[PDB]
Structure 1
């Protein structure tokens, strides 16, 4: 009765194009008269090991970039690099360009991913940016250039572009200005993510959503101190709970009659003894990919 909901994807679907350079095909994002895509599209197998992208780009020309929107070919009249993103200038402005901004998100915030292949949208799902700056996506070959976004009213906030796959199976990318999320680089080399942690404030938000929807068994009368909860958090690899987090949860603590430090004692108990044979909102683990705002959005229908 509570579900992981993605944003409707129509405004973004109209921006997805296909970009080919040599033997590599991936996706581009077409806004006004520019197509954005990962700079590593210009790499060959023998350059992926240790690229010199400035030197690679200087060697490329406008006509080494084949851009197709549907079955209509877009002519590239210029090319430039911003950090790890390639900007391809095209002759035509996208008539479907929505109101949009480029925004860099924070670990713990959520967004929708429009997975695409060959310039064609194929699925949409909701993700969180993990504390270790990876995302636990579902991506196949040719998925590079797929974007993540939020919607606010009529404005699309683009926050993510997909670049690569870490050997642990999680995913890494940049914002739309080409800055990486996390301590990763675009070359084929030994890279590992840092130890992940659980997004504490999101777990609490989800526990409030369970209360709102009629699960109440984990609740208990005991409260706790922020100082004492954060010792338990450290042991179980949870992010520390700050006083900003407690304030953010204010609107849900009011609507349900449960103080944050009380819910923290419930969460402490679940970390120690487990769920003692139960589920919560149809899950047998503690969900951390719903933000406080997500819980309201879904419990209010914005």
Structure 2
């Protein structure tokens, strides 16, 4: 019993983290096979960062200007290319610790683990969600860029995020491992405002199911609702619209608990309308939206 904000074990990703230095800028790189992936802004002087022309900046860079260090051993860079907002540094040595891996571009609402790194060295691991406005709420100081977000399916690491940017509002923006930003963000030190950070309704519902399974049941009410009625309340409270697809995804949790999804919707409706009245659910005074239905089933069933 008990339900914790839980990250994937980080070992497989720890084995991939390197330090990348171009000129005076040091950040993190991901070493998979004989390629090191890192943010292209590694080539910028903080001056350059105001209006960088990366293709022009890159012309002035040779393989030998990219200093790649795996622990205390230097890797030989034998090639470099820009793909969107990442550099791919070809090294002469395949990472011996390369796990089975995929690059995936996640959807908003999807959760992942971040391995926060500085100088290619892991400092911590935490669980994130891709927000509906394509930001993440991370913990990233200077030097953390190139830290990656991942999911693990048994022995295959799906890399979904690389850290690039802090917005002026202290929220985080980054790319997939093909170097494409999540959302409208660009790797330039300019005015970039986030859109509405709406709540991930399907994740809240998953987490209410987790609470019932772990004995927290005070919020269960005598009511039901419809998708359309619920969605009127969701709209009012800056919750994402709930779709039949979301209802379908919550099916297994509905089955295990015997609480119809639309009944749990009606409970969430009362929680929005009435608040928590100083009570808590799984040790939270607010409605948690950084657990997916898949996360709830995983943790509640104990997948390794």
Range into which the TM-score falls when normalised by the shorter chain: over 0.9
Q: Distance in 2 between matches of 1:120 and 1:245?
A: 38
The total of aligned residue pairs comes to: 302
Q: CA deviation at 1:134?
A: 0.5
Greater Cα shift, 268-277 or 13-22: 268-277
1:134 pairs with 2:135: yes
Q: Distance in 2 between matches of 1:110 and 1:277?
A: 28
**Residue 50 of structure 2 aligns to a residue in which SS?**
coil
In the TM superposition, what whole-angstrom CA distance separates every residue of 1:198-225 from its partner, at most 9, and x where no partner exists? 0000001100111011111111121111
Q: Distance in 2 between matches of 1:277 and 1:8?
A: 34
Ranges in structure 2 where 5+ consecutive residues have no aligned partner = none
In the TM superposition, what whole-angstrom CA distance separates every residue of 1:172-222 from its partner, at most 9, and x where no partner exists? 000000000011001110111101100000001100111011111111121
Q: Give the match for residue 112 of structure 1.
A: 113
Ranges in structure 1 where 5+ consecutive residues have no aligned partner = none
Q: Distance in 1 between matches of 2:124 and 2:82?
A: 28
Q: CA deviation at 1:45?
A: 2.5
Q: Give the match for residue 236 of structure 1.
A: 237
Structure 1 runs of 4+ aligned residues shifted over 4 Å read none
Using the size of structure 2 for normalisation, the TM-score is 0.98
Q: CA deviation at 1:70?
A: 0.8
In the TM superposition, what whole-angstrom CA distance separates every residue of 1:123-152 from its partner, at most 9, and x where no partner exists? 001111100010000111100000000001
| Alignment RMSD | 0.7
Q: CA deviation at 1:257?
A: 1.2
Q: Distance in 1 between matches of 2:52 and 2:210?
A: 47
Q: Distance in 1 between matches of 2:244 and 2:182?
A: 25
Q: Distance in 2 between matches of 1:274 and 1:62?
A: 57
Q: Distance in 2 between matches of 1:189 and 1:215?
A: 45
Q: Give the match for residue 206 of structure 1.
A: 207
Q: Distance in 2 between matches of 1:141 and 1:106?
A: 27
**Residue 180 of structure 1 aligns to a residue in which SS?**
coil
**Residue 48 of structure 1 aligns to a residue in which SS?**
helix
Using the size of structure 1 for normalisation, the TM-score is 0.99
**Residue 49 of structure 2 aligns to a residue in which SS?**
coil
Q: Distance in 1 between matches of 2:121 and 2:86?
A: 20
Q: Distance in 2 between matches of 1:279 and 1:45?
A: 45
Q: Distance in 2 between matches of 1:6 and 1:45?
A: 33
